[PDB]
PDB file of C-alpha atoms in Angstrom:
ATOM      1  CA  UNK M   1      -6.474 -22.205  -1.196  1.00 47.86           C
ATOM      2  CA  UNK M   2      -5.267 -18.416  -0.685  1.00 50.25           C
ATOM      3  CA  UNK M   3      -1.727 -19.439  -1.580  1.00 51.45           C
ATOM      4  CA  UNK M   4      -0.393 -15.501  -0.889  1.00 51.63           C
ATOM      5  CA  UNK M   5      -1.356 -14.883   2.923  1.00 52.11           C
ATOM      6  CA  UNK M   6       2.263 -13.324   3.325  1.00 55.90           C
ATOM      7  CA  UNK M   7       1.178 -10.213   1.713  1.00 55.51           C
ATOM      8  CA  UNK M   8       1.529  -6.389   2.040  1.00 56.87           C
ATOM      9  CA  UNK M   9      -2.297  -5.969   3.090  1.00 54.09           C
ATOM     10  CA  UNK M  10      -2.248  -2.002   2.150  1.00 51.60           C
ATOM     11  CA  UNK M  11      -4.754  -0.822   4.894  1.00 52.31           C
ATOM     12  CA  UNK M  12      -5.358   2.292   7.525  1.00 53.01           C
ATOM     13  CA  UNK M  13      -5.816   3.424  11.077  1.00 55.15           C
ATOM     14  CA  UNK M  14      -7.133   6.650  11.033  1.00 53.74           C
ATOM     15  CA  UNK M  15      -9.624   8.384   8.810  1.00 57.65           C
ATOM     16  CA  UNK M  16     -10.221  12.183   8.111  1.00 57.25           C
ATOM     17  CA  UNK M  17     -12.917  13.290   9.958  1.00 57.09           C
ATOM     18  CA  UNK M  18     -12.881  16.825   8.463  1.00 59.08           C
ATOM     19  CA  UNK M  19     -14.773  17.961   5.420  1.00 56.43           C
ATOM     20  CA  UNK M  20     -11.165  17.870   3.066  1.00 53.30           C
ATOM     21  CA  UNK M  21     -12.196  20.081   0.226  1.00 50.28           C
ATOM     22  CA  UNK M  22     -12.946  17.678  -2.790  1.00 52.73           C
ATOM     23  CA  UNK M  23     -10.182  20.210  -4.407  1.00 56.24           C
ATOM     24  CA  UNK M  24      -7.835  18.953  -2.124  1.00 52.18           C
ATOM     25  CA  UNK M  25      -8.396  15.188  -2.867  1.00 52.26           C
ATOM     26  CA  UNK M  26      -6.697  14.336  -5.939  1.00 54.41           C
ATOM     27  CA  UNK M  27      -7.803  11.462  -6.296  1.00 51.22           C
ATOM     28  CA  UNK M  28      -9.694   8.397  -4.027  1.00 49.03           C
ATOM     29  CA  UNK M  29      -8.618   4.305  -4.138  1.00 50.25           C
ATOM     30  CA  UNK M  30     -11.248   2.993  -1.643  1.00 48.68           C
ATOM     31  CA  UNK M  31      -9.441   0.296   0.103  1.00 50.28           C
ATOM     32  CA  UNK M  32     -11.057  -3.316   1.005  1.00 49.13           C
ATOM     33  CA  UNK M  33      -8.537  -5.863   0.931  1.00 50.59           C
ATOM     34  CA  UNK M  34      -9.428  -9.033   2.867  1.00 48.52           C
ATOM     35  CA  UNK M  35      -6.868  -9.003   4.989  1.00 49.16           C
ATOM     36  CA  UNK M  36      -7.522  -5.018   6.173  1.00 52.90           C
ATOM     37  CA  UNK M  37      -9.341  -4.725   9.369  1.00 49.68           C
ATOM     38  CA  UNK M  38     -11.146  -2.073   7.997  1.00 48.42           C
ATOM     39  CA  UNK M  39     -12.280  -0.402   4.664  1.00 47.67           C
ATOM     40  CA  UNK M  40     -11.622   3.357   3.726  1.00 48.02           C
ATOM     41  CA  UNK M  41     -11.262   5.716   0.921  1.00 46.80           C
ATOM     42  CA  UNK M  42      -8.005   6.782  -0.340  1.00 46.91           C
ATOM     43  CA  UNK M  43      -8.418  10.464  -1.457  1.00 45.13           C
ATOM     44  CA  UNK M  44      -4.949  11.294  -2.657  1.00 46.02           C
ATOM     45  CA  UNK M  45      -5.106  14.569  -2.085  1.00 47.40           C
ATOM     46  CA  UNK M  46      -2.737  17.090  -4.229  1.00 48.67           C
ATOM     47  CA  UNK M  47       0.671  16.516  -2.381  1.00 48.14           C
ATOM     48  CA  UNK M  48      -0.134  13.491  -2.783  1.00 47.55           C
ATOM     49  CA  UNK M  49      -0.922  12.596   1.009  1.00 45.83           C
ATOM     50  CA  UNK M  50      -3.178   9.337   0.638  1.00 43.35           C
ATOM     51  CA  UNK M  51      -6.196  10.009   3.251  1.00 43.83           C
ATOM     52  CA  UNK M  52      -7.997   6.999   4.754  1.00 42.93           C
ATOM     53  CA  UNK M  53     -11.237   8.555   5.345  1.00 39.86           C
ATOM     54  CA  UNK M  54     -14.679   6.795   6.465  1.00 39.93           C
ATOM     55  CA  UNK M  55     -16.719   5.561   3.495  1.00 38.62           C
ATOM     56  CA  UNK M  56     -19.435   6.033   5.540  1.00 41.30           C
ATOM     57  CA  UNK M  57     -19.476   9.785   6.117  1.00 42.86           C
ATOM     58  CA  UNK M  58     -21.302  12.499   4.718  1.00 44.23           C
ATOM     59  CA  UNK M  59     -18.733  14.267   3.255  1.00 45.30           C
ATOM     60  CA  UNK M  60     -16.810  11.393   1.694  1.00 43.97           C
ATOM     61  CA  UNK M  61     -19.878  10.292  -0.247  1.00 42.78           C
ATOM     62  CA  UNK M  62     -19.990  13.690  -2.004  1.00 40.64           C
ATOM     63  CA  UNK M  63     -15.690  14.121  -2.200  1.00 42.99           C
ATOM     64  CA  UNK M  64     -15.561   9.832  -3.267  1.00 47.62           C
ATOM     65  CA  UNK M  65     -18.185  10.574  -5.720  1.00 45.05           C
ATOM     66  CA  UNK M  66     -16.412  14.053  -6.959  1.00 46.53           C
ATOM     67  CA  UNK M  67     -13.637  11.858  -7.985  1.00 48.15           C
ATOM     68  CA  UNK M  68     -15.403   8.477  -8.620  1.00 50.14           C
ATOM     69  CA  UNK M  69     -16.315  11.004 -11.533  1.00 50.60           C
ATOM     70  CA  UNK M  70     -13.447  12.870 -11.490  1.00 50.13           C
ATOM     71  CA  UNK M  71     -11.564  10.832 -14.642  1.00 47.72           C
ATOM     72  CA  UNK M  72     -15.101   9.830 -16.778  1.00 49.64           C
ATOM     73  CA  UNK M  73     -14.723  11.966 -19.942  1.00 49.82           C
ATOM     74  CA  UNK M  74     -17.437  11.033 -21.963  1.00 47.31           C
ATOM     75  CA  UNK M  75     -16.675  10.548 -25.573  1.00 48.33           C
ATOM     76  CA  UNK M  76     -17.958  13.369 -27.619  1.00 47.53           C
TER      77      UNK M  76
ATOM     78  CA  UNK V   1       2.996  18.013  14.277  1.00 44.35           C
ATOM     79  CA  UNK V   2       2.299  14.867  11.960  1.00 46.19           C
ATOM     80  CA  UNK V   3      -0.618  16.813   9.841  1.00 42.45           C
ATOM     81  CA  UNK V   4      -1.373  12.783   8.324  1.00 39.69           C
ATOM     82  CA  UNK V   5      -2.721  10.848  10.800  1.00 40.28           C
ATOM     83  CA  UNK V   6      -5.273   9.580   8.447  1.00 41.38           C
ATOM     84  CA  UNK V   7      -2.784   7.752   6.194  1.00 43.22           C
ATOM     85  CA  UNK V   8      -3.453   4.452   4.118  1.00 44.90           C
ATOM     86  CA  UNK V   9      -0.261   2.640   6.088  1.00 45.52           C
ATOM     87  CA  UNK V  10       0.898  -0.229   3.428  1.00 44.10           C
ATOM     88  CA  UNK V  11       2.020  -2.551   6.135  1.00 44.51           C
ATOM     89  CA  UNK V  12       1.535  -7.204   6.256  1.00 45.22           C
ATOM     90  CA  UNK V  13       0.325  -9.247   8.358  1.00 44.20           C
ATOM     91  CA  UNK V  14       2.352 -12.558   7.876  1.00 43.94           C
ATOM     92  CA  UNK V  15       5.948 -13.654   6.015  1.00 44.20           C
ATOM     93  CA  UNK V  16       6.812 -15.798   3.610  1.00 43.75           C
ATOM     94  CA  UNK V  17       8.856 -17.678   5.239  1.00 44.36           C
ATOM     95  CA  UNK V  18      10.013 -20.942   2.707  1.00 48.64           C
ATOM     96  CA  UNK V  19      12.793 -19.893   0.759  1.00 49.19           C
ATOM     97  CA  UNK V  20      11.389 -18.162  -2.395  1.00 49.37           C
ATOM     98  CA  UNK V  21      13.661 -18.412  -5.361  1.00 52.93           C
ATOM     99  CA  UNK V  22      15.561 -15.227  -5.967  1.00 53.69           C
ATOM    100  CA  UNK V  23      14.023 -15.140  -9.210  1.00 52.64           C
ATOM    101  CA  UNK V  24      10.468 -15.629  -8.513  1.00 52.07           C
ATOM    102  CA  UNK V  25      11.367 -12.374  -7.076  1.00 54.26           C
ATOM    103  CA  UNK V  26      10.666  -9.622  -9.992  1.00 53.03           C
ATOM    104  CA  UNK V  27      11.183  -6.765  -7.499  1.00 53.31           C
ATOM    105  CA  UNK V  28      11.390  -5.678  -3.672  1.00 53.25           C
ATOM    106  CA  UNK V  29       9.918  -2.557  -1.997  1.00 51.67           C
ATOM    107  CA  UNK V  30      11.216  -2.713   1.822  1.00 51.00           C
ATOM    108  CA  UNK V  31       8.234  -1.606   4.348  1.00 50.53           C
ATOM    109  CA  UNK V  32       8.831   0.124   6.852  1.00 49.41           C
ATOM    110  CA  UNK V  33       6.142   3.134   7.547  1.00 48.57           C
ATOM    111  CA  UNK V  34       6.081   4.577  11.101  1.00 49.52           C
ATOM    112  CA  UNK V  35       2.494   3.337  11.095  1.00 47.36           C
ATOM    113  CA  UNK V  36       3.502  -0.053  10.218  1.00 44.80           C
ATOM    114  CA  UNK V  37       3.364  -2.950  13.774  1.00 47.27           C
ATOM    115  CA  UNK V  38       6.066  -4.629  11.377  1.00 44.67           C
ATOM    116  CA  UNK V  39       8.926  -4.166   9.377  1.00 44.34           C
ATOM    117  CA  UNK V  40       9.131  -6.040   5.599  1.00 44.91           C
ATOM    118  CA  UNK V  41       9.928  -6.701   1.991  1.00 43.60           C
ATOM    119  CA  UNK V  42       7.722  -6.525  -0.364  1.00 44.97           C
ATOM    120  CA  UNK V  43       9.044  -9.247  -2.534  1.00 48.93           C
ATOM    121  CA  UNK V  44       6.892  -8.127  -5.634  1.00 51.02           C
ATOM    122  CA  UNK V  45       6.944 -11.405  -6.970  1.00 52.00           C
ATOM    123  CA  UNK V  46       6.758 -12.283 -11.183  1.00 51.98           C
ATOM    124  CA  UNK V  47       2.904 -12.207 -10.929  1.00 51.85           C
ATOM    125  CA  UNK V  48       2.834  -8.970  -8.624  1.00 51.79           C
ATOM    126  CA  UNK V  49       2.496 -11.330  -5.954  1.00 51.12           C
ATOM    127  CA  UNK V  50       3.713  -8.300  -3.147  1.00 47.47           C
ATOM    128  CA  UNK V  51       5.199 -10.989  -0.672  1.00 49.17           C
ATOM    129  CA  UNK V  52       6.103  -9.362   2.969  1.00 53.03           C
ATOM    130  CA  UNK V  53       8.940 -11.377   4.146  1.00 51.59           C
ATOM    131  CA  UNK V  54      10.955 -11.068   7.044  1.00 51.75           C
ATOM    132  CA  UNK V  55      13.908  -8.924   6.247  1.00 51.98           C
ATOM    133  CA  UNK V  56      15.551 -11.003   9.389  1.00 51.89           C
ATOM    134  CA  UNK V  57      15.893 -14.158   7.242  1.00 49.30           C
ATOM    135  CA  UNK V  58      18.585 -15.505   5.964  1.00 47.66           C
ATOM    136  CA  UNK V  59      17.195 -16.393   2.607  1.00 47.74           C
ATOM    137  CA  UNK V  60      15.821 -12.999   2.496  1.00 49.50           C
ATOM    138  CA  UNK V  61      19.307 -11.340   3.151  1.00 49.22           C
ATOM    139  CA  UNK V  62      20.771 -12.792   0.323  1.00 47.54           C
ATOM    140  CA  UNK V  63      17.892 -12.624  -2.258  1.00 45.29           C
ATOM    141  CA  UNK V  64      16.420  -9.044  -1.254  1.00 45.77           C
ATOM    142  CA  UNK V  65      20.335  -8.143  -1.709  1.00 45.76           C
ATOM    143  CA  UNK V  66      20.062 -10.082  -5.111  1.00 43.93           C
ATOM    144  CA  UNK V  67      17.209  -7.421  -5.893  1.00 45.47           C
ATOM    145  CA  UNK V  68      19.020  -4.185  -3.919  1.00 47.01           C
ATOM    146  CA  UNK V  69      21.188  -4.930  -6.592  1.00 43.52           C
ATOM    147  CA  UNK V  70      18.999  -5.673  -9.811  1.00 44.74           C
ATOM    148  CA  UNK V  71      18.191  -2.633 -11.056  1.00 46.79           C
ATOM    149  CA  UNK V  72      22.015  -1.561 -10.551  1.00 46.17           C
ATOM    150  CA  UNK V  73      23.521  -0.745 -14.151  1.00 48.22           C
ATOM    151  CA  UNK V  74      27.238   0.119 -13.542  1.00 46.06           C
ATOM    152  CA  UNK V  75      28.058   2.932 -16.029  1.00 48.05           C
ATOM    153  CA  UNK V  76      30.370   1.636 -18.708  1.00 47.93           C
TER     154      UNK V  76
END
């Protein structure tokens, strides 16, 4: 049994409905925990401002990909 | 104006609330976002376990004291 319900269920509320220049996001750590009521990307952008934004737009599947191959350096 | 509305908000949903042994408790990281319905602690456990517990308790008080003062090394 889920013996850990008491837990800090990182989630969001909003999510960044404007195209945020992939530049801008730093980074992404799509969030799904079970316990969040909903799932989301979080592009860390550059000051480091984690933005929930909507998996399911058209601008965060280019940006998540940017940086879901942001860190693959392949070996030479 | 809060330009971050869009902001992963590391919050819990429930508490542990059976006292956990002070030193099951590796490390604490207080919630408390603006975002956040609730308060916390995030009781980061031995195993990472992030436990929210409710910083009201009275076995919290004295064991996320034990941790506000863990990481304390008094200059000698």
């Amino acid at each position: 049994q889920p013996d850990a319900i008491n837990a800090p269920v990182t989630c969001c509320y909003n999510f960044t409905n404007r195209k945020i220049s992939v530049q801008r996001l730093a980074s992404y750590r799509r969030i799904t925990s079970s316990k969040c009521p909903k799932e989301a990307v979080i592009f860390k952008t550059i000051v480091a401002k984690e933005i929930c934004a909507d998996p399911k737009q058209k601008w965060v599947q280019d940006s998540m990909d940017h940086l879901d191959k942001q860190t693959q350096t392949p070996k030479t």
